């Protein structure tokens, strides 16, 4: 895996260059930012009971069919191995908004999971509704301006949004 | 590649956890250092070329036989010194990747991982490199944290030479 | 899935031996008991509306604040209440699946296995589901083998969630 | 794997059903025959090895070529590998004939057994007349009159010749 | 495939080794000994016939119900007899094989390998084998060392069968 | 694997035969010439580190972009893993002129190689160049008439050519 800093790093490398003055000021942007960054990865993973639960109870009750006898989410082992799926999926994501890069959820999590799915009979769509419920409430949890110093979390949010919609692209 | 945070998310992910409060001060310990690092890596790149060539003449000056001596591994030829001076820049553009970093990743992704083959294959000698590590340490004009951190990674490339 | 047949075949395929005298017995215990196995899947089948609707009922006199508190948890909505029912009513149809079986198999591979997460991550407590099993117990009327092979199951239904 | 009663309960499972009591009829049927399937499964069982020498010896005979030097079950190891084949199958007949349900037959011999034979050069219709041989002899085995209380056993006999067929129909 | 030369190069890649003078005098051995193993596969060769048929007589007379008994493993038939010979030959036409490989490779590969189980599943008996291979040792006629090497892969089928 | 010898009897057996005095004729030739066969496996190994480092040395001149940065060869990692592979194939060669035969080389090596490569992004014409130029390196040492009893090499050397031909068109 790399993060923000090896990332750049390993673009320079490609090309044996040195890291421009430019890169580095970027880099010490999202340094400067690295507290709330923090904050970003403790209330997620603060709540994240919560909101594997409220995803995948209101991913349910969208489609009811997954929870019907002969259904993909029917018994328990099934069942159990979604809501695994949903809460290791959030778990990568909390990844990279602390690495500040993709890589690590994209070699260890979504790398080759849509070919697993349809080879399982998984609905990958489904799958993509329920990250897609996961991102609105870590959202609104992360985002949230109560308990927590004011500021503006504007970049780290729509960061936070791109891993999570890079999920449900990968398993679609 | 090792940094502090990618060390902090494999292990969790070893263990199948979350990200505690345990990882979260190692990003403190990273946004504390940060600072330092980045100078660090700024004020080596912009000295690049005079700290490549200054340490390159101490590798030739301690050991005056790698300018005569008959070997596609000697720079006793133009192209020879050539190879030789670029090796050293490897070296120092490693040293600010590792400062970038905050960690000694890149060069144990990038140099050190199947560097002793290289050496035994090419018949060059560790000796060398540790000099011009050396040199550049003497001569790099940092101070304070940067200059620990940078020192921390030239040291690492000789404990890794020798 | 485990019956006496399955896992006699299963364990004489980890030796790589054909089934001898020892495997015939099993099977023919398995139809020694399966006259009341099936019997008791039967009257449970027939009875299923009230016993799922009793025991439904025993579990909300036992436990009250599970039909007033606030929460998809709870059967404080009519849709709660419908949930729980329906999970009650799984729990009865695994009991006439093992009984049809002659074995805890169909409850293991459809029920127990990730129960515990299931329960853990929508806050669900083994001891409601506990208390249903034995009104079933006291109340499906069946006698003999019937009732003895029927109650191995809610008893082992009750040990998995305890 | 399942057998005749789990095959059912699967079947219902995935509709959320109970086992309808027609269903629980015709298991009894299954139950009140069990000492005539045994009969079988023992019968076919304590002459196995006839079985096997007697189907291959006939089969070699038929297909000269195969024990011919370059043929495939020329070398003891490879005619050690056809003996050990027919060896498996027979075996794994005899379990579904106990279990009263294919899907061991399935799962841990025939699945992929197919592809198997044509990596490995082996000619799966051969394997499948032999197959067809050593059906014939447990049947003949199998429904005997000799030593056994008379009776009917026209169902277990169709049943059995099933999973052979579906054994031959695997390896083509 | 076991040749002397083989088990050399087979041992220096379990050790990812280069071949060094250790192996190399393994092929001196190898060149010694090969005018013998060739010779003793030539003398073999071009009295196969008699050899093989003298042999499986050798059989017939020191076990003389193989040749009344019923049965498809016995020469109790024209075809019965025509299989034995058969077997003697594949024998011999191994024991020629090891000579020209100075291994016991090819009877390893093509006759040892599963031949308990060919035994075992047509009953046919080690002991005819274990006569026919004494009779071609007491009948071949070689001598010196292309004698001392048929006997050792001769001897060594008898080792295989008991 | 086979040797030359075994080579001869797989044949033979493939085909039910006794080896015929014709093939015993030519393996004791090459049993006559095996000194040779042995000094130019000695000379080869002795000399080996000379051979990978010059022939890779050459390499990487006339292919400059190889030890570019981004290049296959560039990093420490990837140079130790092509200097390795070159090692790797010379090492096979040496086994195959050795045993007489090239089977070790195809089944211990070159089988599959091709297909490695291009999964890997190594390219393969490159590795060809490089075991195209440790052959004529090795067959100079090989072939040398110093240090040794004068004779004529030139099946051995027409035979070790072969082997590093047969090792550059399998990673092609
Ligand atoms: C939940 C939203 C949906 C769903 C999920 C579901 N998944 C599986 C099975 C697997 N899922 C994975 C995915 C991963 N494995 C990993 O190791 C990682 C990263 C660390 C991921 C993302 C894998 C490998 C499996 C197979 C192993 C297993 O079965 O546990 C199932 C079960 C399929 C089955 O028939 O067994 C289910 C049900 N199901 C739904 O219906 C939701 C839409
Ligand atoms: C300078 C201190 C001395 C010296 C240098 C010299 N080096 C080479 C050849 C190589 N050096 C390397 C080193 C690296 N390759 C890498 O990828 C990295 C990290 C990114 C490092 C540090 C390698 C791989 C080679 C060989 C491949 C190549 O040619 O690039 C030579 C030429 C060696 C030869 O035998 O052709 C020389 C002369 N020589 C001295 O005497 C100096 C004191
Ligand atoms: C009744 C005793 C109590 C109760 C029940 C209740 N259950 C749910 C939700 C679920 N129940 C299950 C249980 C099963 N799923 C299975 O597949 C099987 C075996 C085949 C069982 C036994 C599961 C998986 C869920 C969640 C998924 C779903 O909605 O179907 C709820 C809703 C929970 C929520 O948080 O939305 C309720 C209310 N509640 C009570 O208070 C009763 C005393
Ligand atoms: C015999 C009637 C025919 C025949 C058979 C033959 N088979 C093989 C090799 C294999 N056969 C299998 C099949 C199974 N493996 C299993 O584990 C199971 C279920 C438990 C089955 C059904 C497999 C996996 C192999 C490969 C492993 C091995 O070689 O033992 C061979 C050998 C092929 C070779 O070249 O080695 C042969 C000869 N051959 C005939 O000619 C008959 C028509
Ligand atoms: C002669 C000493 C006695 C004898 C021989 C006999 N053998 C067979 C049948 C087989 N023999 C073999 C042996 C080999 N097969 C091989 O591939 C190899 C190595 C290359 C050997 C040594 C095998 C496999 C068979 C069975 C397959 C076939 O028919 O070829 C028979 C017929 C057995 C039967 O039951 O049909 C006989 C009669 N019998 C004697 O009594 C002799 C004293
Ligand atoms: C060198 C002339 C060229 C080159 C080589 C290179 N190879 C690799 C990686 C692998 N090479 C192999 C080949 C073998 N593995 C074996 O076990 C054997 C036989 C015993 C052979 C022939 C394999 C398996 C790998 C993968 C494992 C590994 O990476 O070590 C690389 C690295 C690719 C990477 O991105 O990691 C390289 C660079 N590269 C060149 O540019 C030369 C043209
Ligand atoms: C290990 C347990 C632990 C954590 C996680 C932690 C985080 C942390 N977040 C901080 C600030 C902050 N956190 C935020 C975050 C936000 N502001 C908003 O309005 C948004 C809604 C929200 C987006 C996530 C902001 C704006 C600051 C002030 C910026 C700063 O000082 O860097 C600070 C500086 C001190 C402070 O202001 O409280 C710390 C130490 N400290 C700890 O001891
Ligand atoms: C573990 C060793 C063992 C076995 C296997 C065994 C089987 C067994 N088979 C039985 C009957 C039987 N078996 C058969 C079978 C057949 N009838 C035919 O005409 C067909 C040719 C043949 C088909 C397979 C029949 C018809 C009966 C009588 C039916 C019954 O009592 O169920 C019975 C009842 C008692 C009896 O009639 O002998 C037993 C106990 N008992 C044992 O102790
Ligand atoms: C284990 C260490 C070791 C090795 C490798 C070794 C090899 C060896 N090579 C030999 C001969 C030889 N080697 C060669 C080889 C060559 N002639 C040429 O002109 C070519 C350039 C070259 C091609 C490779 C020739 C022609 C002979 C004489 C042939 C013979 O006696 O077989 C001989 C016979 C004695 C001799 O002539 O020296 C030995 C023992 N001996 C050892 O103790």
Same mark, same amino acid.
């Given at each position: ?60 009750? +969208? ?23 949903? +809460? ?26 849509? +070919? ?42 729509? +960061? ?13 | ?10 292990? *969790? ?42 340490? *390159? ?58 560097? *002793? ?32 951190? *940078? ?12």
């Amino acid at each position: 895996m790399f993060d923000a800093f090896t990332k750049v790093v390993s673009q320079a490398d490609a090309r044996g260059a040195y890291l421009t003055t430019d890169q580095i000021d970027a880099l010490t942007a999202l340094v400067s930012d690295g507290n709330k960054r923090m904050d970003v990865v403790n209330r997620i993973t603060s709540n994240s009971s919560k909101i594997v639960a409220d995803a995948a109870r209101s991913l349910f009750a +969208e489609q009811p069919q997954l929870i019907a006898p002969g259904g993909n989410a029917y018994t328990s082992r099934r069942m159990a191995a979604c809501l695994r799926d949903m +809460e290791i999926i959030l778990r990568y994501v909390t990844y990279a908004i602390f690495s500040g890069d993709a890589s690590v959820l994209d070699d260890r999590c979504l790398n080759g999971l849509r +070919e697993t799915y349809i080879a399982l009979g998984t609905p990958g769509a489904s799958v993509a509704v329920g990250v897609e419920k996961m991102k609105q409430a870590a959202l609104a949890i992360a985002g949230d301006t109560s308990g927590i110093t004011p500021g503006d979390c504007a970049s780290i949010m729509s +960061e936070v949004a791109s891993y999570f919609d890079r999920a449900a692209a990968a398993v679609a | 590649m090792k940094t502090p945070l990618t060390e902090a998310v494999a292990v *969790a992910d070893s263990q199948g956890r979350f990200l505690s409060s345990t990882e979260v001060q190692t990003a403190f310990g990273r946004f504390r250092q940060a600072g330092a690092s980045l100078a660090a890596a700024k004020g080596l790149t912009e000295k690049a070329s005079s700290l490549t060539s200054g340490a *390159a003449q101490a590798v030739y000056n301690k050991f005056p036989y790698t300018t005569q001596m008959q070997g596609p591994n000697y720079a006793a030829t133009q192209t020879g010194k050539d190879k030789c001076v670029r090796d050293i820049g490897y070296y120092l553009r490693m040293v600010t990747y590792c400062l970038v970093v905050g960690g000694t990743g890149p060069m144990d992704d990038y140099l050190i991982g199947g560097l *002793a083959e290289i050496n035994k294959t090419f018949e060059l000698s560790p000796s060398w490199y540790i000099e011009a590590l050396k040199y550049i340490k003497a001569n790099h004009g940092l101070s304070g944290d940067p200059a620990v951190e *940078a020192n921390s990674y030239l040291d690492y490339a000789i404990n890794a030479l020798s």
